[PDB]
From a paper:
To ensure the delivery of virus particles to the target intestinal cells, allowing the transmission of packages of infectious virus between hosts by oral-faecal routes, polyhedra are disrupted only when they are exposed to the very alkaline pH environment found in insect midguts. The fold of all the polyhedrins is highly similar – a β-barrel core sitting on a base domain, surrounded by a common array of five helices (H1–H5). The strongest intermolecular interactions define a trimer composed of a cluster of three β-barrels sandwiched by helices top and bottom.
CPV14 essentially lacks a V1 extension whereas a long V5 loop forms a hook and an intra-molecular disulphide bridge helps to stabilise the base domain. The full length polyhedrin structures are generally well ordered, as expected for a crystal lattice which has extensive interactions and low solvent content (19–25%), however some types show regions of flexibility: 13 residues (136–148) of CPV5 and 6 residues (68–73) of CPV14 have high (>40 compared with an overall Wilson B-factor of 21.3) B-factors, whilst 13 residues (66–78) of CPV15 could not be modelled. These areas are in structurally variable parts of the proteins. In CPV14, a GTP is located ∼5 Å from the CPV1 position, in a different conformation, binding to the backbone of V2c and embraced by V1 and bulky side chains of an elongated V5. A change in the conformation of the V4 hairpin switches it to bind another monomer. In CPV1, 14, 15, 17, 18 and 20 solvent molecules can move between these two voids, whereas in CPV4, 5 and 19 they are blocked by tyrosine residues.
Author numbering:
A (entry chain A), B (entry chain A), C (entry chain A): 1 to 249
The structure:
């Protein structure tokens, strides 16, 4: 009864799930979870068939549901103070709605070795001046700092941190990653490039908000089967156990 | 008097119009018309010299002029309910401002064979989970479902449908299409690629709103000479009659 | 004492600054300064490692701090009138918040010869109709109209103008430029392309607003060392004097 054709259709399904990862027919994903002091979470899905590239601006990274709006000072009173040094006209030093921490989850067939997580202050300008900005500051080379998580045959990567109370407490970030290519024909080789270029905005960055992590895990993480690690360090991810008829090195 | 030089300058003009289509000097366009229950239309022009790629998020697809705003429930009360199953806190089941139907008009020198119209619910996630999402679900392969419309020598394509009252009644969509290339030198060949890459956001998605189709046809469709088909199935498009000094196969 | 190792570490620093321009490790920048009648400035940084491409829509180009909002007419009353000819329902003919003038500053290692500044009215449509629009109208070929400014070994380019009181007084604009490549290996050659494609949105267009030019020069231009030319024609830019041990042609 282990051998039934129905069981093999189930085997097909799960073999399909593991191979679909490496297949050109799947997406790669980076999810950015932002955790606020009110316990709520704002979440951005970045996604593409072959190449994720996105800026999350300040307005993308602050809490836009439990919003900071003293009915007294317009937004520019505060923005000017995080635009230039001592250039503010705000009685508020730090907005409540700025995130406390983040988690980056890279999943699907990412080549984690190509990932970049470049977090900057409000102006997006690395270093002391624009002409001295480096396109890749050392802390943007985050690949080896991700934790590798495994769930059966599934692999994904997590990177967590605090934004803090300095410049990066008013964050902007650029995130990019490539789909792993285990062979030599480039997904942007001249014979392929136009078909992937046509899909450069499949899909544009997309966000949601949730009242707590626990509620998000039930209503979203599990519902969409998004690999995840909770604050108490529990892995929430689908699990496809490896199927193979021969040994693997 | 048929032969006058002035008439030939007119011939030049119309020969220019037909050949400008196939020329690298023209844009390709996809227009997305969204029709609401109040009879108004929101319209997005997607456009590029060689390669259109765009996401129209939920906020792009709902009616943002005749807006849904009960002065009682914040937007997240409703959004949460179309983010996760049964996760809403809204007394409104379906927003008035969600579109009833759509028309996609692909025109200029599109290769309709490369078009993709991928409509999803709010979360933009095809299938049962992100790791099983297909980059091209069967219904995104819409090319053969477009109707081919001809106006003299001009060719364009239309695809209409209803959003309905299920998941896609809270639509997001990814649209991409390539300019037709009737010969072998790719518009993204290494000798060309950088010049077209420089124009990847020429132009970013752009929208308008109009109180009715009839008013839009007068104030916009005709004014900008955008090929179009009205709800009663009348073609509104410029018409350049073919000019040629010899027979065509 | 001219020869001290400390002085040579200073020489290293400034040699680094000049060579970092031509290095792949720097960004190219286009800044768009928009000057309003209230003397305020809205500023967009466009930036990329190798290829800038951006649309600044109408909502990006109008003053969004000193906002136009008669508590009487919704935005569409005015927008409809700049969408189609005589299609408005506004008692206001021209919004206060539309910019008077602009300056484009191209800096870092731009090849100014590849720049395009295509300014259009509200609809973004060049010419008399979409099928006749040219991807490059003559006035978009702006490269030779930029003024070349030098500050020691630093080179940058400025282009100024008025928006006026016609169609382009309701501006949209597409700006693109490539990083100068003084040799033959293309930054989008197949061996390089995927790494730069991954960084196509590093960074997305980013804006600020400032109450006056003078205040912006202190709080932003100088603070970020952004090359600049003030309204009275004073150059504000860092200055690295050329260092070389041999003569230069
Ligand atoms: N290490 C470092 N952090 C900086 C610097 N400038 C600003 N920061 C910010 O400091 C914050 C985190 O640094 P920590 O040393 O952990 O201190 P913190 O918890 O943020 O609180 P502070 O003591 O106010 O900085 C981040 O927001 C950084 O961006 C800097 O020059 N060096
Ligand atoms: N065919 C199909 N449609 C679905 C499914 N899930 C949601 N829908 C939605 O159903 C809507 C259109 O389906 P129809 O069969 O025409 O029904 P409808 O007019 O939308 O009204 P309903 O009966 O409430 O679905 C779209 O919004 C679809 O996205 C599904 O599993 N299959
Ligand atoms: N030259 C020219 N400008 C046009 C045309 N249509 C609209 N304009 C606009 O005219 C404005 C600048 O032209 P100017 O000749 O300097 O006149 P102006 O200062 O704008 O004031 P007006 O006399 O109302 O046009 C810009 O906003 C142009 O876009 C046109 O067909 N030719």
């Amino acid at each position: 009864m282990e051998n039934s054709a129905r069981q093999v259709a189930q085997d097909t399904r799960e073999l399909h799930l593991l191979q679909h990862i490496k297949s050109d027919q799947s997406y790669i994903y980076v999810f950015v979870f932002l955790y606020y002091r009110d316990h709520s979470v704002r979440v951005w899905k970045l996604t593409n068939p072959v190449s994720i590239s996105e800026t999350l601006d300040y307005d993308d990274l602050i809490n836009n549901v439990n919003r900071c709006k003293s009915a007294r000072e317009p937004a520019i009173y505060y923005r000017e103070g995080i635009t230039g040094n001592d250039a503010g006209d705000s009685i508020i030093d730090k907005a409540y709605c700025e995130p406390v921490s983040f988690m980056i989850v890279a999943c699907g067939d990412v080549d984690i070795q190509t990932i970049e997580v470049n977090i900057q202050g409000y102006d997006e300008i690395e270093g002391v001046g624009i002409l001295d900005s480096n396109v890749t500051p050392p802390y943007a080379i985050t690949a080896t700092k991700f934790e590798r998580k495994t769930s059966g045959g599934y692999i994904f990567y997590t990177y967590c941190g605090l934004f803090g109370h300095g410049d990066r407490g008013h964050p902007t970030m650029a995130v990019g990653v490539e789909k792993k290519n285990r062979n030599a024909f480039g997904r942007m080789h001249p014979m392929y490039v136009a078909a992937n270029y046509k899909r450069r905005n499949f899909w544009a960055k997309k966000d949601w908000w949730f009242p707590t992590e626990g509620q998000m895990v039930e209503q979203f993480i599990k519902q969409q089967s998004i690999p995840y690690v909770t604050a108490d360090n529990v892995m929430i991810a689908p699990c496809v156990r490896e199927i193979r008829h021969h040994a693997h090195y």
